[PDB]
């Protein structure tokens, strides 16, 4: 009666202490989950933005353009060297 | 007594409020986790796809071919210039020593 | 009365219903956190490998090695052109009018 | 009865520490996921930021432009060489 009254009031004290404990921890876990996904998402966007920045499709276009220019300069040199070879042959023949 | 019945009825009522309060907070936490992993996982998949579909390799190949072609031509031009030097040498020796 | 018996037998049986409800959800949640980070870790490793396999530093390397060879042919031609001009100038002393 | 209640208090004490232990374990499995994945993301970003080669390709473009200038200047030197050969030829019996 007085012992059963102690038991029940003990249950209600210990239950609500435990219920609080578990509540407080869940809130901490919820803060943890919110911040953790906020950071993973931020770094995932930085990854995409860093890959975006590393674009060098334009570097390659420009390099290919200077190679074609050197190619055209080389073809003129070869033409010039054919004409020079002929003037050498002429001079030697004409000595 | 009516005391123990009132203590139990109060205990029972509060226990179910705390339990349903815990249950809902755990479901909200589980829902958040699921949506967290779901959303990040979608964007990482699309990140891998888009990396895989880049093709600079094709372009670096072409440039390497075009440089091999320039290299072959320059070896050809070095041969022409050796012959040109030999013909100049023959002109020099033959006019100097002959004449 | 059996009204103290009933109310408690009810609170005992459904508070155990609740507790298993929580234990079961907490055991799902845990399993999901594990399979979650396993999934993102694996995708992140696959990201790093997708990047590594589109790293062409070595292909650019070879490109640069091959441009160094053109440079060395150009150096060789420029030296031959220097010697040639000197031999042509020497013709001005040896070639009769 | 005193027993109906006393068993409840114990079964509820143990279910409770049963729960707090799986929770604190989840709370830590979560700190380790975020710490682990986040540093793996930092790696990834750092392995993109070490992998930029727009400058590498620009440098090769510059090497090509230097070769083009030497090629064009050799062509102007050989056109002088041709003028020198023509003058010599102009001076022979035949030219």
Numbering used by the authors:
A (entry chain B): 72 to 166
B (entry chain A): 72 to 170
C (entry chain D): 72 to 168
D (entry chain C): 75 to 169
Provide text from the study.
Crystals were obtained for the POD of munia bornavirus 1 (MuBV-1; 77% sequence identity with BoDV-1) and Gaboon viper virus 1 (GaVV-1; 41 and 43% sequence identity with BoDV-1 and MuBV-1, respectively). The structure of MuBV-1 POD was solved by molecular replacement using BoDV-1 POD as a starting model, whereas GaVV-1 POD was obtained de novo using Se-Met derivative crystals. For both MuBV-1 and GaVV-1, the asymmetric units contained a tetrameric POD, whereas the tetramer for BoDV-1 could be obtained after applying the inherent symmetry operations of the tetragonal space group. MuBV-1 and GaVV-1 POD presented similar architectures composed of two α-helical coiled-coils (the monomers being parallel) linked by a kink. Globally, the only differences concern the relative spatial position of the two coiled-coils, due to the inherent flexibility induced by such a break and the crystal packing. MuBV-1 and GaVV-1 breaks were also composed of three residues, with a strictly conserved aspartate in the middle. The Ramachandran analysis showed that all of them fall into the β-area, with neighbouring residues at intermediate positions; this confirms that this specificity is conserved in all Orthobornavirus P. Using the Vc determination on the diffusion data, the MW were estimated between 40 and 45 kDa, 12–16% lower than the theoretical values, all corresponding to tetramers. The three X-ray structures fit perfectly with the SAXS data.
